[PDB]
Amino acid sequence: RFYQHKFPEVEDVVMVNVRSIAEMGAYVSLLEYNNIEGMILLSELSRRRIRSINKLIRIGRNECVVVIRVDKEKGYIDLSKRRVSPEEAIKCEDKFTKSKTVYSILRHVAEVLEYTKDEQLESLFQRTAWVFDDKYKRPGYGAYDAFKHAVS
Amino acid sequence: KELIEYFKSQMKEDPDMASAVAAIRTLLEFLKRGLRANLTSAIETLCGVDSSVAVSSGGELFLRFISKIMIERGELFLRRISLSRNKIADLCHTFIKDGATILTHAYSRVVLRVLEAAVAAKKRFSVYVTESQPDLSGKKMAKALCHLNVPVTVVLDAAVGYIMEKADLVIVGAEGVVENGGIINKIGTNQMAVCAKAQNKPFYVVAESFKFVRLFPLNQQDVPDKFKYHPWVDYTAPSLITLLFTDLGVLTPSAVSDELIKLYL
Amino acid sequence: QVPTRKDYGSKVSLFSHLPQYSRQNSLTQFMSIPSSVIHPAMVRLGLQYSQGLVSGSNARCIALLRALQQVIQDYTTPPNEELSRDLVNKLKPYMSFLTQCRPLSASMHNAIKFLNKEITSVGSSKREEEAKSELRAAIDRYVQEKIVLAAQAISRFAYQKISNGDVILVYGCSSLVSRILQEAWTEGRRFRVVVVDSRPWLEGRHTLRSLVHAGVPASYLLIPAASYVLPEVSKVLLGAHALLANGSVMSRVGTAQLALVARAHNVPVLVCCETYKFCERVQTDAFVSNELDDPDDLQCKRGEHVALANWQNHASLRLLNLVYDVTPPELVDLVITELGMIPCSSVPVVLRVKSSD
Amino acid sequence: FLKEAARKRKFHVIVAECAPFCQGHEMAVNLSKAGIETTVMTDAAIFAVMSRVNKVIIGTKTILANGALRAVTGTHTLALAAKHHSTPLIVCAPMFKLSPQFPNEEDSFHKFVAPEEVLPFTEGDILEKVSVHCPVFDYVPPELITLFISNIGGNAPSYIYRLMSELYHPDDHVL
Amino acid sequence: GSELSERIESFVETLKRGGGPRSSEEMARETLGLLRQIITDHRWSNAGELMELIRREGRRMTAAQPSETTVGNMVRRVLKIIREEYGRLHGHYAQLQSNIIEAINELLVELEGTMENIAAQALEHIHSNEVIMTIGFSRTVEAFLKEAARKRKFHVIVAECAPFCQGHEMAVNLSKAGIETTVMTDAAIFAVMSRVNKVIIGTKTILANGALRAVTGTHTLALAAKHHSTPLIVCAPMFKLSPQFPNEEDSFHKFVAPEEVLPFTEGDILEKVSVHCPVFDYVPPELITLFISNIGGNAPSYIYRLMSELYHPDDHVL
């Protein structure tokens, strides 16, 4: 949904809610495209000898995950913390929040003949999101998608 | 042989220790003669012919410590031995209640130095050395630390089972410590411990770093018989030994096994 | 995947967090009898658990080990689902299946955790077949080193411990206590072992028979009169299944009260559990995580006038029987394991020095 | 006792049966003609069930001259459990069967019944090489039981010597 | 940019008015929030003067309020981890403060994951149609009881400590989930202790001998439970552990105004009877049974391994 280029790029930032935890891993449900469910990864929830399982993650909250390199059937869907050493995080939280507002105004397009069941949501989203890659900066895409609905 | 006369020299000339560092610096002066390890085992047996636990345990931690280079290791190991007394002295004189009545045991350097540290922090207290006789053991502590202005009133060793109403803090000396979590000392040690556990009143215990021993008793005759020579040094299950004290510091009953298994028994 | 087993008769008012079974109707009355809904070794191990065929100490571990090795070393590797991560989640019906069958010994939980950790240790970058054979080499070196090298290592150490004339007792059904007995006996020793057992398993049989076939003098008394071995016991070997992180141990109905009646004399209890048995689940009371076998196996043979046949006719009578139990860490003192002879309360410090540090 | 108590009340009687053989199962049948909710636990499992039971009673065969009894067996591990958790002990006794017998008359205080209740005649190559012995009556030390019920009211366990001296002149205790 | 001193002083000054806030772990929340700021403009050159700045300000923060170590174990925590990271740097300057604040982020996710962990480790104890007891008030044992209320059908009793009735509130709270608990007075801690089956407690601080330090009535509850030997499960998160000992001074307990236990409606009596009460007792280590902790369970005298790891003991004395 929130950018139809679904499988995101290599060493970017995103956030995620964790709906259910596995036996071994913690398979998290990513929200920057509708209803997939990813994972976690082993090594770096830190950079030294922490090694624990449930004191970092709720069944329910968010955090600022970092992707290393995801492919399709090599099966490396990277949900961890690598190298946020001076790095800002909460830009992606505001990206997340503004995209949720973009959803919230457009989840209800929902015109007055109550057809909640399935109106084709891309028929009202896709054509209204399509030409908005006018510049390449993705934080510039952040200020430009914030610029999208301040309609005047 | 060559390696008993300097051993007698270090057990006699310097009073600041036991026969433990006598064994240590004796088996370091040994090296002035991968190719010596079983020779070191034989000669640590030959120097651990004494009626003592600390000498044979120091020798086994030598064979561990080997497992052109280890001369300076041994020098700084003697540095590990030297300042350990002042470290346990400034670490171990604080838990004494002001107004409490210590009951101690026969002559060790360690409760001497720690009660001298408690006097140098100037608490108001009273110590009872006990007598512990297969021989004269308690009266020498009685005089040596009535030299330092404490009312030292020696209780009879069987009379310890009644004096425990007025002993809320029972400290003992350090003769041998084992991987169960216990301490072996002169015979009149176990009886005050069993009575102290019947008293609901705590039983603290000092020890030392390189006096760690890696054998194991379970019951009465599970003590080693090369230390006996009637018994000489006795103990049982460590169910109530309340606190142990080290170069490492404040250590619980289990943690001497932790320092042992860190260095693999 | 799998259905569950129905209840039989009634139950006590207390244990309604615990299911009870019968062996007159089992799991595979109905399910996919050519086993391809679930792997064949699983329904194999399940319905031979339902008649108690492998009811051993670490025998159960090695039975599930052979079952899961027949799972893994013929395993089709499907595409569109990843090299190493379609195994462990498809293994969630396996242990939930055996949990439904008759619940797990904690030994099988330790096996689950180790082969879990190792199939994570080989991920995607290797082809599935020689990764499967390296998994075979890892699981074989694991069970060999831990189980077998622990058995002979504690044999050498308890051979240094146990001496002449030490009349030692067992509550006997394992493959470690009778093991230590025989390979301490056959080296020039002497000790009159006595077994004790209990209704309704009536099991001392493997231990006493293996002693007599190893040529050891045996005696015999059942725990409903265990106060008659009360003076004369010199030491006692306690065969425990699991060993928790209190310092506790963990075995049957009939290591429950011999532990306290032999703490009541200062006869030093001696439990035998190797490095494999150091668990992490920690219970305190005796009804919490404890199974309950078939509750109509306790009947009497008094001619034919049995009291417990038609026990559903009248209103409020019941039956029950517990199977496992936990003893407190006061009583138990010495564990028999590898690195030394570690005591009770200092157990899990060994469990952290063989846990990837 | 329990039949009158269930004539007028409602309660919960678990019945351990001490098992070289059964003598619990008959009152496990005969204790449901008044609806009393009985649960027949098997007495090798006593050290689990302290943490429900509040008063743990027994029935005994006769009572010695120290405050101690002889009952059907297993009652020693029962009472040595019921002092680890400090629970009470009613002991029912009508007064025909009290005894001034002190335990120094002879051994076989117990009654060694034959071990055809512990090894029946399917055993293997094993039976003539192992020592097989069970008591049928086992002994509770006098230090544990707490209350008695008599035909003259309740009584203590550390008081019964007056009942002996009232009911027997002590010189004819060896007959 | 030096507006930092005022809130150190406001924090120790609200540590002198009893201690804010009301509840237990929100104390830990506000103190680690005010502990991650201790290097904002607080600048230095080498690690040694940074260490001595944490020395001086930490010891005045601990001696300003000595009846609470939840700030003291955390300032020992931060000094330990910063000397740990400098030691890993060497084998001086650059990459330090970043990794410091990253480690603080790690432990601040931990301390709020605590009560979820203790709530989710809470069905491996409790059965059907038995009773259970707890004394005092902690929301940790409240999480335990509400979890077990969500899944089973049992029958709580609560005996309350009443110099101030901090136990009636959970006593009404626990009938909201439909348990049907029965509340006696604390005269009957032994009259019903035959017909108890298990009792849990919520500690406050556990020393470095494994000896806890809890509310009034817990010492008599442990040593009145072992006249039935029913086990004591202690509720004890990993932040409110202390490396302390019973011996440093007194005010190990905390003496409050004793008008909690006497009124001013008596007549002429209160001129001489010199009343006293602590709010906190002291319990032997060797009597409680096991942890329900944020690593899992531990034996009540295992704790020295954890305090070998978490606190570098040469600067535990600080």
PDB file of C-alpha atoms in Angstrom, chain B residues 94-95 200 240 243 250-252 254-255, chain E residues 208-209 223 245 247-248 286 301 304-305:
ATOM      1  CA  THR B  94      32.241  -4.160  58.143  1.00  0.00           C
ATOM      2  CA  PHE B  95      29.478  -6.701  58.813  1.00  0.00           C
ATOM      3  CA  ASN B 200      18.829 -19.653  64.082  1.00  0.00           C
ATOM      4  CA  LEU B 240      24.405 -23.668  57.054  1.00  0.00           C
ATOM      5  CA  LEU B 243      28.931 -16.436  54.136  1.00  0.00           C
ATOM      6  CA  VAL B 250      32.019 -11.494  49.375  1.00  0.00           C
ATOM      7  CA  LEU B 251      31.127 -14.995  48.239  1.00  0.00           C
ATOM      8  CA  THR B 252      28.037 -17.073  48.898  1.00  0.00           C
ATOM      9  CA  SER B 254      28.144 -21.928  46.056  1.00  0.00           C
ATOM     10  CA  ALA B 255      30.565 -19.476  44.443  1.00  0.00           C
TER      11      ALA B 255
ATOM     12  CA  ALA E 208      23.622  -9.521  47.267  1.00  0.00           C
ATOM     13  CA  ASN E 209      23.199 -12.500  49.553  1.00  0.00           C
ATOM     14  CA  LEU E 223       8.658 -18.192  59.056  1.00  0.00           C
ATOM     15  CA  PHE E 245      24.093  -6.134  52.282  1.00  0.00           C
ATOM     16  CA  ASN E 247      25.444  -4.201  57.239  1.00  0.00           C
ATOM     17  CA  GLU E 248      26.383  -0.778  55.835  1.00  0.00           C
ATOM     18  CA  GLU E 286      17.383 -19.496  53.013  1.00  0.00           C
ATOM     19  CA  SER E 301      21.129 -18.156  46.601  1.00  0.00           C
ATOM     20  CA  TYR E 304      26.037 -14.113  42.859  1.00  0.00           C
ATOM     21  CA  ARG E 305      26.508 -15.091  39.193  1.00  0.00           C
TER      22      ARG E 305
END
